[PDB]
Design a protein around this ligand. Structure first.
Ligand SMILES: CC(=O)OC[C@@]1(C)[C@@H]2C[C@H](OC(C)=O)[C@@]3(C)Oc4cc(-c5cccnc5)oc(=O)c4[C@H](O)[C@@H]3[C@@]2(C)CC[C@@H]1OC(C)=O
Ligand SMILES: CC(=O)OC[C@@]1(C)[C@@H]2C[C@H](OC(C)=O)[C@@]3(C)Oc4cc(-c5cccnc5)oc(=O)c4[C@H](O)[C@@H]3[C@@]2(C)CC[C@@H]1OC(C)=O
Ligand SMILES: CC(=O)OC[C@@]1(C)[C@@H]2C[C@H](OC(C)=O)[C@@]3(C)Oc4cc(-c5cccnc5)oc(=O)c4[C@H](O)[C@@H]3[C@@]2(C)CC[C@@H]1OC(C)=O
Ligand SMILES: CC(=O)OC[C@@]1(C)[C@@H]2C[C@H](OC(C)=O)[C@@]3(C)Oc4cc(-c5cccnc5)oc(=O)c4[C@H](O)[C@@H]3[C@@]2(C)CC[C@@H]1OC(C)=O
Ligand SMILES: CC(C)CCC[C@@H](C)[C@H]1CC[C@H]2[C@@H]3CC=C4C[C@@H](O)CC[C@]4(C)[C@H]3CC[C@]12C
Ligand SMILES: CC(C)CCC[C@@H](C)[C@H]1CC[C@H]2[C@@H]3CC=C4C[C@@H](O)CC[C@]4(C)[C@H]3CC[C@]12C
Ligand SMILES: CC(C)CCC[C@@H](C)[C@H]1CC[C@H]2[C@@H]3CC=C4C[C@@H](O)CC[C@]4(C)[C@H]3CC[C@]12C
Ligand SMILES: CC(C)CCC[C@@H](C)[C@H]1CC[C@H]2[C@@H]3CC=C4C[C@@H](O)CC[C@]4(C)[C@H]3CC[C@]12C
Ligand SMILES: CC(C)CCC[C@@H](C)[C@H]1CC[C@H]2[C@@H]3CC=C4C[C@@H](O)CC[C@]4(C)[C@H]3CC[C@]12C
Ligand SMILES: CC(C)CCC[C@@H](C)[C@H]1CC[C@H]2[C@@H]3CC=C4C[C@@H](O)CC[C@]4(C)[C@H]3CC[C@]12C
Ligand SMILES: CC(C)CCC[C@@H](C)[C@H]1CC[C@H]2[C@@H]3CC=C4C[C@@H](O)CC[C@]4(C)[C@H]3CC[C@]12C
Ligand SMILES: CC(C)CCC[C@@H](C)[C@H]1CC[C@H]2[C@@H]3CC=C4C[C@@H](O)CC[C@]4(C)[C@H]3CC[C@]12C
Ligand SMILES: CCCCCCCC/C=C\CCCCCCCC(=O)O
Ligand SMILES: CCCCCCCC/C=C\CCCCCCCC(=O)O
Ligand SMILES: CCCCCCCC/C=C\CCCCCCCC(=O)O
Ligand SMILES: CCCCCCCC/C=C\CCCCCCCC(=O)O
Lengths: 375, 375, 375, 375
């Protein structure tokens, strides 16, 4: 099987036309309005803009380092393919663009001492460009195993909200500029929501870990106290970056099949959650690691490949965090792995939800402790 | 107009057959499961059963005081009507046995020093019996203005989840004992949820008001800190007592028109919220105070009657709280009245939601302050 | 008259298909190859990359200041028009976007001490956005004098290589990505050519003005010595930025009428030179200042309007330089004005060419003297 | 094959009817006008006539030595042919009067100490007369191998701008005295241009070689500094002497086939440059050395003959310079030979252009060094 693209609509958008979800959405903006009013009234007797101005420290440098990587991934893979499919150098040149968007985004991140948020930008624009600079290549190589795709398609592909290089991409009539304006306004409102959640419900609880005790009561009640910013951070990450950001960019570009996420909130088991959360990266990962795995290995055993894919995902995410916060502290992978082992060796939706809540609680707690015991 | 009863089903129940609301519902039970696991793990190194055992102090006395009340409202109204509609003493009987249900529930509440939760029972039961006893009378009197309803109907009426005496009451085929068992299980799970919210997120913040400062920063940040238990208390009150309790009792009795609440969460303006929140008491109140008001006054001016009804509601609710917590501190009525004045003299749904959030925040904050500065 | 757009080709491109111009072009790249070989061989016993790394000092800041101005000019004028043509605020809001891309690009240029080359960027992206944010407005207002243009057209307009808002823009079949790659390669080769010309034939002659004499022989022979970098700077500015840059951007966007310049090298008189050099800004300037001048003034006298337009151009260019090099030294305007006066009071192509050569010679000489006597 | 003459017109003249080349031509006269104005203004606070008056020292002697030469080549070849084709002394006469034009122009050049420019006259005139006297003879001898051309034709031939004796010479209707006046005016303007280039951009840089260092940096940067007078000297030599001088003399005489040069500026390879630069001497040289070589040798190997011809040309040119500047310093032949070897053992137009630029740069540099280290 290979994924085939339809003119289906982002699931939450086809829900939001129902009234009750317009209500829930309104309740959440009301939540923001209470936070802004209360914080404005307190800090009057200025705002928590400090986390923003601190976290985006050298954002200028972070973007002028985004340009070289973008130009590398735009030119190097295409020229590699076009010249390599002309009978060369191509077997090397592909190497350089392996080493330029692998070495540069670390050198400018460590040697210049960037903050967390202005660093994550580059982290994400070296595990994008490998995912595509490789997707594109492995898609358009088996066309040349016949004993050169249109460039305009490859340019369009680098910005298109999917990681699969299909060069068809079913498109929509026109650009609803009102809709994209709304989506960006929501995405920026979402960043401001996250700014408040951190600056109000994370920093105050976690600042005082210089405290001597390290009593297990104190730690476990810190975990329970921190589980809620955990879930709102997840819901915000999800909503903004998988509904607002990719729809906005799928409306500027007139893209179809905007199923970037299936309803993960209905995922009975855990694997279903992981398949239906961030479906774009899942589909890239699924396609390449689970239809080159079962092809090259040709293994009747598939469970090996399921866990194979998922540890590839876990290792990638652990690396992302190990880079952003500048630690080597791999909590998430140990959690995912150990309970992976637990459920796979030894109404059902609720157990998944509870374990996801504690997953979030543990990750946020230990990462705040590590960020405020390394400073 | 007079309200007429159909075999419609409780709006949230017709929503819960949709999958995404089964998910939200599951997320909330997962919330409970996290609280029980974390609290069990913390109190291990017993539970917060103390608030329950304290709050239900003389619950035996609270119920053996409920019995005289129930017998008074069962017998006195009917015997009065039956003898009064036989041409007497009825005019004296009702007036003399309107005091038992008015005097007794205060005498056993103040002179015996009951806790809050074991007192609110008798508060709700005295207002409940006043409401539906008077309803019954004023419904069945104009039948006698002709120059005696079946008793079994009146007995059934006292337990029926409506306050309007219609003596038709469209009924359902049979009793789904699985469904009522589920609804009571949810209602009791809801009480346990409220027990955790109080014992974990209200008592700790509000215990230390013996603190001298009374600094406006401290108070306003306590209000913001307390706005969230406020909203969960409201949602729990609503869900348990207007969907679980009255559906359970509307399934044991085989009642129709289970529209005890319209979608208040879609109420654009405030009046709409008040008309569509606790629709049962609204409809009683609406019918009697707004179709005896506009009849006896015969006033072309109706806005007077709108505010008339709403201050009747506010005064009743203020009285309920003034009784339960044993204060004379009327915060809610001042808030409702003042912003009533504000909006009625001087996407729109969001403003209502934000002001409801702060309404909850102020009420919970000041009532916790008053309960822990009167003790 | 109003300018109307045809599918004509950039004049130099329709010349370059002739062979002899491919030769001249090749001679000039050979010139670059000699410079790179000779400088590489000298500096071996590294390169003149110092002028580049110095001149682009805070280029990150220069671009993250480009983003706010771009967003201001994108949103403010359109919203102003759309709401103003709905019967307001619009009469103010237009003011803010007057003050944001007028105040910000000075504040970030002076208060942060930017170099020359990283400053000119912002200079040019505040006399672009006024030229358009005003062109667009004054085009689409007389449509509303009838007692709202498509936004997509306005977005496309901000990047389109013309300053006239026509919202038709005759377009070409497809994108010749080979051609745009070639044009950008030439534009970057051109920047490198200018880098060599400065770092080899300007800095060495002009560095030693700390020298006491100020003898008129020394100055006049410095002027003759510097007249040649003057002409190559002009030819490079012209070729790269009016043939390479705007063709590249007119090929990515599929734009017609690429007559950004007529053959100014054939301009018999001076006015003809100014009309046929940078025809895009000329046509904006021509249209607005010479078809609102002769409309509002309604003056039978037009010579006044000719000089009117040209002093508007001169003042704008003087301001550009007064900003970039951070001087108040207005040499160009005095030269243009005085010889303007000279020829307009008191084979012919050659005189124009000679006076252009000395114009370049004087400007480059005095600006190098001023930059190395203010440092 | 033997070259056959058509009524084609000098390629640059058929280009100059196009407007853009009238512009380039005008730019160059403007260059002269800037030089004359700037030098007049500098030497005011007389001109560089000193190089002219010095370089043309004994020009009277140089011309009264030209007369005996011209009379020898006019009479000796013809009388020899006429008497030799009468059956004698001719075999002795020519051999005895081939020494007058070989011995005299050296004796009057060395024994009288002439300057460079007044000497080059006699150099060119001795090689010119050798070339066309021998041409005439070897053309009109095989007519006598039959077991006497009209003299007027031979007189006309000595002044005709070709070196091939064809005695047909397709002629034009009339003498455009305006055109010849223009061409001589340009040729004299060209000499004045070369006078300025030497007196302004060669003498100053090269005067100070008495300087001790002989540092390789100093020499190599002198080569780069001197490459530009090199190219303008070449372009001037070419333009004046191959378009102005020979057209002027081809218009006074009413000559056809004025293709004295093909477009060498389009020569892809080097051999093409040498075949299409100074086509008149090339055609003489080609015809005699490459259609007596391949006749007498009868060699299947032709590459030998290609290099044969070219070293004949190189040796002749080396001799010309060895005579004019009075050195024995053969730089040009070593350069031509070595890179000949380089390319013939071990868009393409650009490499030729770059190597031509450095060829000019090296020749001018080393010849200025040798002229100012031998004085
Ligand atoms: C340290 C950091 O930067 O994370 C920020 C944060 C919000 C992330 C954002 C992250 O978003 C990204 C980059 O994907 C997300 C959502 O992504 C993963 C990935 C996996 C996973 C998936 C497949 C296989 N193996 C592991 O497990 C998870 O539960 C989650 C978590 O929920 C996280 C978190 C929400 C957990 C709470 C975190 O907050 C802090 C301060 O620590
Ligand atoms: C002191 C007490 O016993 O209240 C318990 C509590 C939960 C109540 C339950 C109550 O439930 C009842 C008895 O109806 C409810 C919901 O009912 C009203 C009534 C009116 C109202 C309506 C019409 C006219 N005038 C006023 O406005 C409100 O927002 C609310 C509030 O939300 C409250 C509260 C939720 C506010 C927060 C409170 O918590 C504490 C500790 O103070
Ligand atoms: C100081 C600076 O940044 O200029 C750089 C430089 C290259 C500019 C670039 C500039 O390019 C721009 C911004 O337009 C350009 C070409 O634009 C004008 C404009 C007018 C003019 C036009 C109409 C009315 N009034 C005056 O007069 C001119 O001759 C020229 C000149 O040639 C200049 C120059 C080439 C003169 C030599 C300069 O070099 C130095 C170091 O001083
Ligand atoms: C020393 C001298 O008198 O030369 C004057 C000068 C201008 C000559 C004029 C000369 O003009 C003549 C006599 O033909 C010319 C152009 O002719 C040749 C001949 C060959 C050649 C051709 C075939 C085979 N082998 C060698 O290669 C060349 O590039 C060139 C050069 O460019 C030169 C020069 C331009 C080089 C620069 C020189 O300036 C100085 C001061 O040294
Ligand atoms: C712009 C600011 C206010 C951010 C708003 C975030 C809100 C609108 C987004 C973010 C996460 C989203 C929620 C995440 C998933 C679910 C579970 C599903 O069973 C009901 C919808 C619901 C509850 C979504 C509703 C919309 C949502 C709440
Ligand atoms: C709440 C405070 C810390 C603000 C946090 C700012 C960071 C975490 C947010 C704000 C804007 C977001 C970025 C904007 C869009 C992109 C481009 C995409 O290709 C990769 C993710 C990335 C780079 C986002 C990652 C998360 C992000 C960087
Ligand atoms: C039994 C325990 C877990 C209590 C469960 C409480 C949950 C299931 C009840 C109580 C209050 C209810 C919510 C109150 C009103 C709204 C707003 C509406 O736009 C979406 C549904 C939603 C969000 C309801 C869903 C169900 C709900 C959340
Ligand atoms: C969270 C802690 C304080 C538990 C609170 C217990 C109280 C507030 C709850 C638990 C059971 C509830 C009662 C059960 C049912 C009835 C009968 C009805 O006719 C009036 C309301 C009344 C009397 C409810 C009022 C609220 C109630 C008394
Ligand atoms: C890429 C590097 C080498 C820059 C190249 C610059 C060259 C190719 C460009 C820049 C300026 C241009 C010249 C400016 C104007 C003229 C005058 C005209 O009558 C002939 C063409 C000519 C001479 C142009 C030819 C092409 C040109 C010389
Ligand atoms: C020779 C050395 C000093 C390098 C000079 C770099 C400067 C002068 C060059 C290099 C790139 C050029 C810029 C690139 C493109 C633009 C965008 C356009 O909308 C305004 C002009 C502007 C901003 C150019 C101005 C001149 C420029 C800034
Ligand atoms: C009389 C004075 C000013 C001397 C004038 C010299 C000028 C007019 C002559 C001398 C050498 C000639 C140039 C040499 C060869 C080329 C290369 C060709 O691809 C374009 C024409 C061009 C550029 C010629 C144009 C005319 C030219 C520049
Ligand atoms: C720039 C300064 C040095 C002036 C140079 C003067 C010399 C180099 C110039 C000026 C006039 C030219 C001469 C005029 C015409 C002829 C006759 C021809 O049959 C041989 C070449 C010859 C003899 C020319 C050679 C070069 C020449 C001698
Ligand atoms: C495990 C790592 C997760 C990586 C997340 C990748 C995000 C989705 C990837 C590609 C589609 C995004 C295209 C639109 C964003 C353009 C923004 C930009 O280029 O700056
Ligand atoms: C303003 C005060 C609000 C009063 C709330 C009244 C609740 C609804 C009234 C009557 C229907 C309830 C019938 C089912 C409960 C019977 C419980 C019992 O008798 O113990
Ligand atoms: C007198 C000031 C001269 C201003 C020069 C203006 C240049 C021409 C103006 C607009 C067309 C340019 C459009 C293409 C450039 C896009 C570059 C960018 O947005 O960064
Ligand atoms: C290699 C040496 C180059 C020799 C260059 C020869 C120049 C061309 C030869 C003959 C045609 C010239 C005829 C016109 C000039 C006559 C001048 C005169 O007699 O004074």
């Amino acid at each position: 099987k290979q994924k085939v693209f339809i003119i289906r609509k982002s699931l939450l958008d086809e829900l939001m036309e129902v009234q009750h979800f317009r209500t829930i959405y309104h309740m959440f903006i009301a939540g923001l309005c209470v936070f802004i009013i209360s914080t404005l009234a307190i800090d009057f007797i200025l705002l928590e803009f400090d986390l923003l101005i601190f976290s985006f420290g050298q954002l200028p440098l972070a973007l002028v380092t985004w340009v070289p990587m973008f130009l590398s991934t735009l030119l190097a893979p295409y020229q590699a393919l076009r010249l390599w499919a002309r009978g060369g150098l191509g077997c090397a040149l592909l190497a350089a663009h392996a080493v330029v968007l692998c070495a540069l985004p670390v050198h400018v991140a460590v040697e210049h001492q960037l903050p967390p948020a202005s660093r994550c930008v580059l982290v994400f624009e070296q595990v994008r460009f490998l995912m595509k600079s490789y997707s594109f290549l492995r898609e358009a190589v088996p066309g040349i195993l016949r004993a050169a795709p249109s460039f305009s398609s490859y340019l369009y592909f680098l910005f298109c909200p999917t990681l699969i290089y299909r060069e068809t991409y079913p498109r929509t009539p026109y650009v609803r500029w009102n809709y994209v304006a709304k989506n960006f306004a929501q995405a920026l409102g979402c960043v401001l929501y996250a700014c408040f959640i951190l600056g109000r419900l994370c920093v105050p609880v976690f600042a005082n870990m210089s405290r001597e005790p390290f009593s297990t009561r104190a730690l476990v009640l810190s975990i329970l106290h921190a589980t809620l910013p955990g879930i709102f951070m997840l819901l915000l990450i999800f909503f903004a970056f998988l509904h607002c950001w990719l729809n906005a960019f799928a409306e500027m570009l007139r893209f179809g099949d905007r199923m970037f996420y299936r309803d993960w909130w209905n995922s009975t088991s855990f694997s279903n959650y992981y398949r239906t959360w961030n479906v774009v990266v899942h589909d890239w990962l699924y396609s390449y690691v689970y239809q080159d795995g079962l092809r090259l290995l040709g293994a009747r055993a598939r469970g090996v490949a399921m866990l194979g894919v998922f540890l590839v995902s876990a290792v990638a995410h652990e690396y992302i965090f190990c880079f952003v916060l500048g630690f080597f502290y791999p909590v998430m992978l140990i959690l995912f792995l150990v309970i992976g082992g637990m459920l796979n060796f030894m109404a059902w939706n609720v157990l998944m939800w509870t374990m996801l809540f504690l997953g979030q609680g543990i990750q946020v707690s230990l990462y705040c402790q590590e960020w405020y015991a390394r400073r």
